[PDB]
Structure formats: structure tokens, C-alpha cells
């Protein structure tokens, strides 16, 4: 036999997830890539990202604790 019976619990919500349940990251290290600007500029990529709205985008990774803001910088 390859026939399987399922049991469902449907009395009430067991949990409620965020609408942003399925969220994504960009690793902090992507901002050490010279081509950063071009990459996140990509319209195609934005079409793909918009498909996952609503979602958080977490900018972090190992490089988080090794990055320093330079407002003099270009």
C-alpha cells in the first residue's frame, strides 16, 4: 500500500504567523562588493523581490560587527 490517511485539526488557529512570515536577508558582506549599486539597482531583481512583498529584508551577517559608517565617503 502507498495510500496514506491524513488527520486535520481545524477547530481553531494553533498560531498566527506574520504576513511577512516568509522573509529574506542580504548578507552585510554584499556591501564590500564594488558592484553593490549596480546589483540592487537591477530592475529584474526588483521584479523578483516585489513578488515576496510583504516581507522583512534583514541586512546583516558576520560583516555586521566589522562595518563602519563613513559619511565623508563616496
Amino acid at each position: 500500500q502507498d495510500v496514506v490517511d491524513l488527520d486535520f485539526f481545524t477547530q481553531e488557529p494553533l498560531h498566527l504567523v506574520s504576513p511577512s512570515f516568509l522573509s529574506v536577508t542580504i548578507d552585510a558582506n554584499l556591501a564590500t562588493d564594488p558592484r553593490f549599486l549596480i546589483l540592487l539597482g537591477s530592475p529584474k531583481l526588483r521584479t523578483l523581490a516585489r513578488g515576496l512583498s510583504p516581507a522583512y529584508l534583514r541586512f546583516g551577517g558576520t560583516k555586521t560587527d566589522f562595518l563602519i559608517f563613513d559619511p565623508k565617503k563616496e
Binding site: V4, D5, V24, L45, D65, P71
Partner: protein, 385 residues
């Protein structure tokens, strides 16, 4: 290993506009290894950055530190969880004395229990648990360097995750009950992912199972490492083509609502046939209140047929079955929905996602090494209303 780098106001604007015009909620992780003599968090740098973000009207949320358990290994600097809690508070003050004083604060993005991470997380939640809006932790199943194809297909590997979560909820229930629990960064395999594994159809087993278990065990948000970048576990490769996890994520987002329910298999084995139940996602114009979304993983080497229980046995079911495009099977970087290859129509345009309606009363066909969504139309579950 890792040394200090700067970034420009410019960098910031890229990342903000990316998220803004994409419709996502930027969370920005701040440098926590900026230290004062007494090993306090030196807040001045972040302060500069907030001024600029504030001075642009940037709607942004915040983190402080990533995987703080590693700092000793990483930067020959050990911060006890107590101090990190104290630093979180220093930052909450700075946010409160800012233009968006309602801005959310998440942390401490600790590694999974396996990394001997409990003591740090318990001490950090006792110390600074009051000022964070969610607890963030990270999870990977495997080492990317050693991970095999059979690891990706092994239910015993998937099952380790259950205990990971249990051990997290143990620390949190003992220090900040009712606090929302988030996976801050998670995928298949650490060190950037498993080459030729993390970017294929085969990666879908660990990704859809992680989503199922997280929803089921009370995880409120799951953050996929990464949407785009260097690592093999990217949803979108370096040529901006979507990988099969991306199509899986998109199908998940259209079909699965916020109300988590429960399905399980009658056998004394619920290991290789894994099943999840939510209310159908309301925002989807094809479906009405009461409708259920079942999602199923088949890790057996043959087709299994699923039978819906009373009183949903005779309902109309729409199949959304995902299978690799050949010839690389589970190692393929291309997937088919109900036997139709999934691709962008053009750079501006995603395809339709086309159901396959089943005859009412048919058992639910789930081929070997495959995952599927099944929408139960007119289920009329009151809890879903």
C-alpha cells in the same frame, strides 16, 4: 580573519531604495564590536548613521550584533550576554531620542543551540529582553563543505530542527514568555551553502519543511539567507535568474494564510511523508473564507496517495505540484508547476501560477522526492473566517 570596512551614505541609499521600491521592511544590523575602554558599546558611529537615516525620512528597523557567541573566535573579544543586554538598552534610548522613536529593535541573532548558545541568550534576555520587539536566532542544518545530496533528502536531518526550536522556546519561556520568536537568518548549510545542492530543487525539502515546522511550533517570522549574493543558498543567482527555492517561496506566499492548523499521517511513521495545514491566504482572489491550504513533502522513493479526512473527502482540490526540469533531476536549477516550466515572462513580469484541478473524490497524488500545495475549495472551516 575578518577586518573593519567603511560604507558610504551612498551604500545606505542603494539598500533603502532597493527595499522601498521592492515593498519590504528593511532591518539594519549595527556594528556591536565598537567598544569603549570598559568594554561598553561605543554608540557614536551608529548615532551618526541614525542622524543620516532620520535626516532622509528612512522608515527602517534595527539589530545590534550578529552571532555574538562567535566574537571570541571572530575578534578575540568576549561579551557576556548581560553586557549585550545593557548595550541593547543604550540603543533603545538612542532610538527613543530619534525621529522614529517607535522603530522596532530585534536581537540578539545568536547561533542555534548546538553552538552552546543557551547561557548567552538566557543572560541577554534577562538583561535587555524588555527593549527588543522579537527574539532573533539563526539555524543551518549542515556544513556546506561536507553536506551530501543524501543529507538534503534525510528526514532524520530535517527532524533535528524540531529540538533546535524546542531548546530556544525553553530559554524564552523561562525569561520572556509571550515575546515573539524569529529566525533572524537561516538556510540549508553554513559557510555560504553546499555547492550544487543549496541552489537546486533538492534544497526545497529543507526550505519547505523549515517553513512548515516554524509556523507549526510558533515561529512568527523566518528570514531566508539569502535573497541574492555570493552564497550557494541564494533564491536568485548572480545572473538575476530565480532558483527553484524562489518559485517555492512565491507559490508559498500566494497560497498559505497566517492561521496555522495541523495535519498528520495515520501511520506510526510521520517521517518521510511530512504534511502541514494553514487557512488559504485571503489576499488570493481565486479562493474564499473557509478554504484550507495543505502542503506535503514526499521523501519516499515511490508515489504516495493522500486521502483527505471527513468531512473534506469529496471537496474540489487544486494541485500545485513542483518537480525539477530534467536532465539533472533533484540537482536541477529549474522547476515545473503541474508540468509547466516556471520562468519570468520578461524582466518586469512574473508568470501566472496555474492550479491543476483534481476530480472531486480522488486521492491526492504525490510523486517520489516531490513537494506540493493542495487548496481545498469550499472546506468552510469557521476558524479560517
Amino acid at each position: 580573519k575578518f577586518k573593519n570596512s567603511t560604507y558610504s551614505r551612498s551604500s545606505v541609499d542603494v539598500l533603502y531604495t532597493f527595499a522601498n521600491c521592492s515593498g519590504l521592511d528593511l532591518i539594519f544590523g549595527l556594528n556591536a564590536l565598537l567598544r569603549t575602554a570598559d568594554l561598553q558599546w561605543n554608540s557614536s558611529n551608529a548615532q551618526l548613521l541614525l542622524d543620516y537615516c532620520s535626516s532622509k525620512g528612512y522608515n527602517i528597523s534595527w539589530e545590534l550584533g550578529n552571532e555574538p557567541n562567535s566574537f571570541l573566535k571572530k575578534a578575540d573579544i568576549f561579551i557576556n550576554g548581560s553586557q549585550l543586554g545593557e548595550d541593547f538598552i543604550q540603543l533603545h534610548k538612542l532610538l527613543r531620542k530619534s525621529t522614529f522613536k517607535n522603530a522596532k529593535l530585534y536581537g540578539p541573532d545568536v547561533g542555534q543551540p548546538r553552538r552552546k548558545t543557551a547561557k548567552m541568550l538566557k543572560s541577554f534576555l534577562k538583561a535587555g529582553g524588555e527593549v527588543i520587539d522579537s527574539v532573533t536566532w539563526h539555524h543551518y542544518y549542515l556544513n556546506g563543505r561536507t553536506a551530501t545530496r543524501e543529507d538534503f533528502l534525510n528526514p532524520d536531518v530535517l527532524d533535528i530542527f524540531i529540538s533546535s526550536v524546542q531548546k530556544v522556546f525553553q530559554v524564552v519561556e523561562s525569561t520572556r514568555p509571550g515575546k515573539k520568536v524569529w529566525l533572524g537568518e537561516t538556510s540549508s548549510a553554513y559557510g555560504g551553502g553546499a555547492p550544487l545542492l543549496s541552489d537546486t530543487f533538492a534544497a526545497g525539502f529543507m526550505w519547505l519543511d523549515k517553513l512548515g515546522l516554524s509556523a507549526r511550533m510558533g515561529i512568527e517570522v523566518v528570514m531566508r539567507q539569502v535573497f541574492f549574493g555570493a552564497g550557494n543558498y541564494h533564491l536568485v543567482d548572480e545572473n538575476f535568474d530565480p532558483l527553484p527555492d524562489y518559485w517555492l517561496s512565491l507559490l508559498f506566499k500566494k497560497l498559505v494564510g497566517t492561521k496555522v492548523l495541523m495535519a498528520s499521517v495515520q501511520g506510526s511513521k510521520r517521517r518521510k511523508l511530512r504534511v502541514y495545514l494553514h487557512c488559504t491566504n485571503t489576499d488570493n482572489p481565486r479562493y474564499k473564507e473557509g478554504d484550507l491550504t495543505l502542503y506535503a513533502i514526499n521523501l519516499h522513493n515511490v508515489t504516495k496517495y493522500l486521502r483527505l479526512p471527513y468531512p473534506f473527502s469529496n471537496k474540489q482540490v487544486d494541485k500545485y505540484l513542483l518537480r525539477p526540469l530534467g536532465p539533472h533531476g533533484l540537482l536541477s536549477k529549474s522547476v515545473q508547476l503541474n508540468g509547466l516550466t516556471l520562468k519570468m515572462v520578461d524582466d518586469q513580469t512574473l508568470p501566472p501560477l496555474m492550479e491543476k484541478p483534481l476530480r472531486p473524490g480522488s486521492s491526492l497524488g504525490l510523486p517520489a522526492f516531490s513537494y506540493s500545495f493542495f487548496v481545498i475549495r469550499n472546506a468552510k472551516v469557521a476558524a479560517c473566517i
